[PDB]
Write a structure and sequence with these properties.
Chain E: It is found in: Nucleus. The structure is cut from a larger assembly and holds one copy of chain A (about 90 residues), one copy of chain B (about 50 residues), one copy of chain C (about 120 residues), two copies of chain D and one copy of chain E (about 130 residues). Chain B has one helix and two strands, in the order αββ. With about 50 residues, chain B is α+β, with helices and mostly antiparallel strands. The chains are: A mainly alpha (about 90), B alpha+beta (about 50), C mainly beta (about 120), D alpha/beta (about 300), E mainly beta (about 130). The interface between D and E is medium-sized, with 22 and 34 residues. Chain D binds a DNA duplex (37 and 36 nucleotides) through helix 5 and helix 11.
DNA sequence: TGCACAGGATGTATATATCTGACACGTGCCTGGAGAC
DNA sequence: TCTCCAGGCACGTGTCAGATATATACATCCTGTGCA
């Protein structure tokens, strides 16, 4: 048993490019890329939460970590996508 | 152990080789649909009329 | 028009003739009587076939009304239904129509016959 | 039980001489039973049940293995077809060593085709043989064919040929056949061409060929009669043929000679729609009546 | 050079659904018609407008018939009964046709020859829509 | 179409005039299950129904529409070779026989399959795209089943040593490629075990490109016979 | 001595025919994410 | 922390892309030969 993200990112590619094939090595690069991005974002958030003497990770410290890591227009588009996703998910009423 | 595994592998391989060597009507009627429609039956000895 | 009335076109057609004795008639119509469909079971002395009926066939059946035992002749390409007569001679009959058709025999042999007409 | 026993005895005598035999009789008399009788007679002669390569087109591969299984079931059958894992397990099967001859062996008769003699030349370069028969060798006639090239690289030292009609006479086909039969003696085509033109050509190949014609047996085979039927040209075919003649392009001429719709296909006959409507510029789909007129008041 | 949007296939399901008040005076009796079309190597389902369904039912289609819908004008052509069912049990000299090749939804290019007088008499006496 | 920019009343009036429910209901009919739903499950009497079914019937089924589909009889009459093949095949089927036809193109047998399905003849096909297993059971069903009629074949597949003893009538559609490969073509057919007279039909079209290479084929026949 | 014409040789063009060759889809299963406290 | 079921994994089978081959007629190019 081993874990990969392959079906999800495959679906992401079929949403915008239906007639496009895939090399397995390309999944190896892109899986390493998404794991590396998750890696830096998560330890930046943990480092920031350890700074503020807090024991809890919420949306705001990863928001600040996204603002710290990503370039500015990617930062603003990423926080736009994240805020609309978390407000859609938070409307469970 | 090794001899039994070799015999099982040889048996499966010979079965695969034998499989490769030896292996490599009236139309149905139309659907009849009569829902919510009246019926006239003219049989041999009696006549019927089913209405709504 | 007077010029074109004097030119004749001879057209050749392939038809199929069906002559037999009627056994069972089922006619399914809607409530307003517009959409009509049904099945017809006709027989000869050798075979027995169930046919499907359209609107024009049902209109041709309900005129000169066949009563399950008449010997009829159907031309497929022309859509003509001809009631030759009654072979069964049923005793129990309703006292409304005449039903005084002549006594004929049930036809024997092939039910369907191909023919060429011009 | 027929007169091919004399032909197989002649082929055995030619093999005892030390040269590669010739058989070019047209099909219809059953050279397959002749070949299995050749194999049975040589196996009764010098006691060989060993490996036997035979090249055969893939259309008659199943027919040949069926007639081998139906006729003489003493030998063992190891065919070659399928997927590369099946090819790998057949490569596991035929792993012979110390050469010469084996009695308890699964590789007595194995099949092949030209298309994988061509593509598997690395694995088949080794394992020197003793008998290769090129059944239906009419496709070998190209001198630049790579199938002929890696057929020439075999270390079998036997080149018995089976074919129906070798008389295509392309002036390199005959030299290619003679080079394949005797590789040391025939190596130059210029000396073959340089060294009356009809009688000598009959005497070039005279000791090798045997003259057998189909009209010697009881002719219940059918006695085929050629009925040539001629047809005229329809006006659509006439229009496309005069267009093709105005352009003068051969395959187009054939494909409009047989049927007009190989060039263009007749489509739906519909009135020209003078409408503007909702068109797609690409669990169900919605369609709504949306036809309007281009003329607007 | 004329481009046609074409839906075609074999009718497998013909299911309408009704309005709330059919005797309301305004609006038709039905609201939608679900049509299931099957072609070679494809299958599609459509929710038909009632105005398309008038031309569909004017052609007297049924389950098991191969149809041909032209989206440019809304015209429907009933090709014939499908040959996947039986043949010799009919009495209406119908024509039997195989399944259409390709997908249900198509686009094709058609070259037409048309004079200006044809356009003039087409616009003068308009026949070819689905309106009254 | 008449448009007034910036007014919704004109759109409602135009939609009411073009798609009047009374006239459009008069020119059509209600479905049967809908009529059953309103008459029984809603209590509406028959006389309160809207007026339906006043559209006049056409003369034929063909006269009900302006769209004409490519015909099949025309597909057969615009090619003279296919027409004469149909005329010969009518009496061949009336005789109750078994027949092979050889081809040279993919679509020349693809359309011929459509002709057979129009004629509802029993037929199976063997060509280059066929897998190796199919060339066993297809020949088995050919040599066993007598109710099969047509065997569509290519040249190098169905003409190389395959047992075709259950046929005598071979038809050459356009196989005029080489005299040697054509001479090998009935060698799969004209074989031992045949029980009746073998006839070969070679249909050709006249005064065409067929005559351009048939003379060369006859010249090649004479050259390969004298040599 | 140079040039022009004719004959032979070869390229090619486009649909074949075989014919693989590496890709995308239809069934098990089990365990881990989701609901509840 | 208890429960429990279906998501995504793992393992089979068909379907459009490349590759040699036929093939003959047509067109073009090269070379030989005769003439001024």
């Amino acid at each position: 048993r081993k874990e990969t993200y392959s079906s999800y990112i495959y679906k992401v590619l079929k949403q915008t490019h239906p007639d496009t094939g895939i090399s397995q090595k390309s999944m190896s690069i892109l899986n390493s890329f998404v794991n590396d991005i998750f890696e830096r974002i998560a330890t930046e958030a943990s480092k920031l939460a350890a700074y503020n003497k807090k024991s809890t990770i919420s949306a705001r410290e990863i928001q600040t970590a996204v603002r710290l890591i990503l370039p500015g227009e990617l930062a603003k588009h990423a926080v736009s996508e994240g805020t609309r996703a978390v407000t859609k998910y938070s409307s469970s009423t | 152990e090794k001899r039994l595994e070799e015999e099982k592998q040889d048996t499966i391989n010979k079965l695969l080789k034998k499989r490769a060597g030896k292996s490599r009507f009236v139309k149905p009627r139309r659907p009849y649909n009569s829902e919510g429609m009246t019926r006239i039956l003219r049989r041999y000895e009696e006549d019927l009329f089913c209405t709504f | 028009q007077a010029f074109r009335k004097s030119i004749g076109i001879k057209i050749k057609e392939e038809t199929e003739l069906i002559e037999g004795e009627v056994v069972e008639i089922q006619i399914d119509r809607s409530i307003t009587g517009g959409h009509k469909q049904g099945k017809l079971t006709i027989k000869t002395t050798d075979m027995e076939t169930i046919y499907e009926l359209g609107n024009k066939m049902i209109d041709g059946l309900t005129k000169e009304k066949v009563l399950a035992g008449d010997v009829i002749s159907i031309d497929k390409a022309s859509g003509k239904i001809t009631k030759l007569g009654r072979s069964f001679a049923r005793s129990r009959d309703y006292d409304a129509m005449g039903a005084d058709t002549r006594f004929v025999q049930c036809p024997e042999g092939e039910l369907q016959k191909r023919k060429t007409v011009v | 039980k027929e007169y091919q026993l004399k032909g197989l005895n002649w082929l055995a005598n030619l093999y005892d001489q030390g040269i590669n035999g010739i058989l070019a009789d047209e099909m219809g008399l059953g050279k397959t039973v002749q070949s299995i009788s050749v194999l049975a007679h040589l196996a009764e002669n010098h006691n060989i049940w060993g490996p036997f390569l035979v090249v055969t087109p893939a259309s008659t591969l199943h027919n040949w293995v069926n007639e081998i299984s139906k006729f003489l079931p003493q030998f063992k059958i190891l065919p070659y077809w399928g997927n590369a894992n099946d090819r790998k397990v057949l490569r596991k099967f035929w792993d012979r060593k110390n050469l010469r001859y084996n009695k308890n062996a699964p590789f007595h008769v194995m099949v092949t085709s030209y298309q994988m003699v061509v593509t598997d030349a690395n694995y088949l370069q080794k394992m020197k043989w003793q008998y290769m028969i090129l059944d239906e060798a009419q496709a070998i006639k190209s001198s630049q064919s790579s199938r002929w090239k890696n057929l020439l690289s075999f270390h079998c030292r036997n080149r018995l040929l089976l074919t129906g009609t070798p008389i295509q006479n392309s002036m390199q086909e005959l030299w290619a056949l003679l080079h394949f039969i005797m590789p040391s003696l025939f190596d130059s085509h210029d000396e073959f061409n340089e060294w009356q033109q009809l009688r000598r050509l009959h005497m070039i190949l005279k000791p090798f060929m045997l003259r057998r014609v189909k009209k010697n047996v009881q002719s219940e085979l059918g006695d085929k009669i050629e009925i040539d039927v001629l047809c005229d040209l329809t006006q659509r075919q006439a229009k496309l043929y005069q267009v093709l003649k105005s352009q003068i392009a051969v395959m187009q001429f054939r494909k409009v000679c047989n049927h007009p719709d190989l060039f263009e296909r007749a489509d739906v006959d519909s009135p020209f729609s003078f409408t503007t409507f909702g068109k797609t510029t690409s669990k169900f789909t919605d369609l709504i009546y949306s036809s309007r007129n281009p003329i607007k008041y | 050079k004329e481009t046609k949007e074409v839906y075609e296939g074999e009718v497998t399901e013909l299911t309408p659904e009704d309005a709330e008040n059919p005797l309301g005076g305004y609006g038709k009796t039905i609201s939608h018609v679900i049509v299931g079309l099957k072609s070679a190597k494809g299958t599609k389902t459509l929710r038909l407008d009632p105005t398309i369904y008038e031309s569909i039912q004017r052609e007297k289609v049924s389950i098991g018939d191969v149809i041909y819908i032209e989206a440019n004008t809304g015209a429907v052509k009933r090709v014939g009964r499908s040959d996947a069912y039986a043949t010799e049990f009919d009495l209406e000299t119908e024509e039997y046709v195989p399944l259409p090749k390709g997908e249900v939804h198509k686009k094709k290019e058609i070259v037409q020859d048309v004079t200006l007088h044809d356009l003039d008499v087409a616009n003068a006496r308009p026949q070819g829509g689905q309106d009254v | 179409t008449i448009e007034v920019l910036g007014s919704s009343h004109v759109t409602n009036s135009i939609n009411n005039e073009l798609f009047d429910p009374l006239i459009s209901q008069a020119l059509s009919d209600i479905p049967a299950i809908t009529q059953y739903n309103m008459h029984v499950k809603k209590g509406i009497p028959v006389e309160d129904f809207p007026k339906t079914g006043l559209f006049p019937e056409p003369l034929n089924k063909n006269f009900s529409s302006n769209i004409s589909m490519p015909s099949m009889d025309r597909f057969i009459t615009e090619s003279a070779k296919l027409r004469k093949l149909d005329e010969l095949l009518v009496k061949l089927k009336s005789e109750g026989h078994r027949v092979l036809i050889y081809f040279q193109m993919t679509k020349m047998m693809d359309l011929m399959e459509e002709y057979l399905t129009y004629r509802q003849y029993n037929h199976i096909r063997l060509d280059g795209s066929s897998k190796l297993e199919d060339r066993r059971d297809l020949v088995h069903d050919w040599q066993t089943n007598p109710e099969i009629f047509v065997f569509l074949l290519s040249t190098r597949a169905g003409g190389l040593g395959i047992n075709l003893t259950a046929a005598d009538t071979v038809i050459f559609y356009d196989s005029d490629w080489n005299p040697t490969i054509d001479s090998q073509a009935m060698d799969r057919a004209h074989r031992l075990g045949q029980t009746r007279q073998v006839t070969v039909y070679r249909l050709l079209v006249r005064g065409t490109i067929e005559e351009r290479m048939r003379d060369r084929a006859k010249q090649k026949e004479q050259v390969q016979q004298v040599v």
